[PDB]
């Protein structure tokens, strides 16, 4: 859906259920980078899209990608949330289901009240720049 590959580190987390220690690999966040010569090769190899361009198309295309890929991410991920409850039981559900889903229910999060104050305060923030 995005940055390719994945990273899993070997660790023993046991469990909160006190089961005999088993290994479920924890996800490690992966990022793409380079140093000097590895930058030279690919930066010439692009020959595709404008660079960057800073300030105009860059931020708004990222608003499409990060937004829309964030829509279908949680969509298909919430599709797996219900599908795993529908099919695939057990566990499945438990464990983290009740706590993770309540973390989703942590913040609805709307006004009243102070969130109304943040509104016209944000309006007062756009004052200066405009």
């Amino acid at each position: 859906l995005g940055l390719p590959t994945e990273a899993y580190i070997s660790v023993e987390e046991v469990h909160d259920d006190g089961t005999p220690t088993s290994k479920t690999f924890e996800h490690v966040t992966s990022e793409i980078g380079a140093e000097e010569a590895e930058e030279v090769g690919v930066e010439h190899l692009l020959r595709d899209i404008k660079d960057t361009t800073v300030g105009t198309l860059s931020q708004r295309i990222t608003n499409q990608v990060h937004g829309l890929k964030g829509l279908n991410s949680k969509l298909l991920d919430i599709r797996s949330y219900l599908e795993k409850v529908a099919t695939g039981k057990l566990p499945i559900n438990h464990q983290i289901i009740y706590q993770l889903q309540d973390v989703f229910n942590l913040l609805p999060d709307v006004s009243l009240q102070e969130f109304v104050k943040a509104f016209y305060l944000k309006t007062n923030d756009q004052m200066v720049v405009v």
């Binding site: 259920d17 006190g18 005999p20 499409q64 949330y81 438990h94 706590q99 989703f104 913040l107 009240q113």
Partner: protein, 373 residues
């Protein structure tokens, strides 16, 4: 040597029948089908004066065979120690079997659990915590056997029986609740097992609710056999909070050990409702009033300070208290439990965010799609 096992060959009617094969097992010099058949005779309840005499021949086997795992030697010594009735001479012989046997599989975990199982009569408190601490330290690598971790719960539960930090018993019994895969034992034992487990886990001060693990699927069948006053009062500690009838009903059901922790439970539910009052409402609208807390917790207006601020020290809420109108302003919340209907409405709160961003962002670049080219 042969006559030593011949005099013990007949333990009663029907015993020499299978023992004719037992004596033909070591003639072919196979100690394994011999191990399974002798261990079956050791597992077979007897006087038992047969295993006490023949254990020297089984020791002689371990001498020149040098191989057979100490696991079977622990399984036979736990049957013999019951007939020996003296734990001291059993500790000298078992520690002798610990120092005289070495294998790639760690024998310290099975020997220390056997020492801990035989340490109940010492009686306790002296060397217990040291060897009990050594069990799980040597079990950390590599816990693929799954068999000895239940023995670790045995010596840890008997370590808890001194009372003993009730809050720790649920963690140790959790270790057992996850250690054994299939119960394969009568529920008549596990109904009181999960009962006193529910008692020591609920009366613990470190855990105010943990209503989530109260719903754990392997213990819920054990709760079905239990009377429903415990399950209903566990729902009172799951949500509640008062619900003054159910918190009294657990005093009707369980007389002992509740009188000391009763006031602690009342404090635990008084700090439990604070997360659920702001969590239940769509809100936020996270600012409450003194009338809401004082009416629900039925406590005086002077003690609501200690009430809400102790919950700030517990960590379930970071909120602040407005003492002019005596209002209480909650911040964040402590997630506890919550249901398929909630996964549905969750898709509603999601898909709405989906069509929101989709529409608006597709409107943004709808304007500037021309000028790009």
């Amino acid at each position: 040597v042969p006559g030593f096992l011949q005099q013990s060959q007949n333990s009663g009617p029907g015993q020499p029948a299978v023992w004719h094969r037992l004596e033909e097992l070591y003639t072919k010099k196979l100690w394994h089908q011999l191990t399974l058949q002798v261990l079956d005779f050791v597992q077979d309840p007897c006087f038992a004066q047969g295993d006490g005499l023949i254990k020297l021949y089984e020791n002689f086997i371990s001498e020149f065979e040098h191989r057979v795992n100490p696991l079977s030697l622990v399984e036979i010594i736990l049957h013999v120690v019951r007939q020996m009735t003296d734990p001291n001479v059993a500790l000298t012989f078992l520690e002798k079997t610990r120092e005289k046997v070495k294998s790639s599989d760690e024998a310290v975990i099975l020997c220390k659990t056997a020492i801990g199982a035989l340490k109940l009569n010492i009686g306790d408190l002296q060397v217990t915590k040291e060897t009990i601490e050594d069990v799980e330290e040597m079990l950390n690598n590599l816990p693929g056997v799954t068999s000895v971790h239940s023995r670790f719960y045995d010596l840890s539960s008997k370590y808890y029986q001194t009372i003993g930090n009730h809050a720790s018993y649920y963690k140790d019994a959790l270790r057992f609740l996850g250690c054994v895969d299939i119960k394969d034992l009568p529920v008549s034992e596990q109904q009181e097992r999960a009962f006193t487990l529910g008692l020591a886990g609920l009366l613990g001060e470190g855990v105010f609710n943990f209503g989530e693990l109260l719903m754990h699927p392997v213990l819920e069948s054990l709760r079905n056999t239990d009377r429903q006053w415990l399950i209903d009062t566990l729902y009172a500690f799951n949500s509640g909070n008062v619900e003054r009838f159910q918190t009294l009903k657990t005093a009707w059901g369980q007389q002992p050990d509740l009188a000391a922790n009763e006031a602690q439970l009342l404090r635990k539910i008084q700090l439990l409702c604070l997360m659920e009052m702001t969590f239940t409402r769509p809100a936020n609208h996270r600012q409450l009033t003194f009338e809401e807390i004082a009416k629900s917790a039925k406590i005086t207006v002077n003690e609501v300070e200690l009430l809400v601020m102790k919950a700030l020290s517990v960590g379930l809420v970071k909120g602040s208290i407005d003492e002019v109108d005596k209002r209480v302003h909650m911040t964040w919340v402590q997630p506890r439990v919550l249901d398929l209907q909630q996964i549905k409405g969750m898709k509603d709160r999601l898909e709405f965010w989906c069509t929101d961003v989709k529409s608006m962002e597709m409107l943004v670049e709808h304007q500037a799609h021309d000028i790009l080219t």
